[PDB]
């Protein structure tokens, strides 16, 4: 898998309430997190399917 799949989820500093998906390598699956709408890192997907396709 790409090494960005190992990053902790990153909310960033902005105030939005956007549900995104990150890969949790210890758990071996994607989970949801709240992204704040700026400064997204790479481990940040718009669906579980894209997250698992990229990082599974």
Swiss-Prot record:
The record marks 15-16 as: Reactive bond for trypsin. Coiled coil: none annotated. Disulfide bonds join 5-55, 14-38, 30-51. GO terms for cellular component: extracellular space; serine protease inhibitor complex. The keyword Disulfide bond applies. Keywords: Disulfide bond, Pharmaceutical, Protease inhibitor, Secreted, Serine protease inhibitor, Signal. Its main location: secreted. The keyword Endoplasmic reticulum does not apply. It is found in: Secreted. Residues 5-55 form the BPTI/Kunitz inhibitor domain. One of its GO terms (molecular function) is calcium ion binding. GO terms for biological process: negative regulation of platelet aggregation; negative regulation of serine-type endopeptidase activity; negative regulation of thrombin-activated receptor signaling pathway; trypsinogen activation. Inhibits trypsin, kallikrein, chymotrypsin, and plasmin. This is Pancreatic trypsin inhibitor.
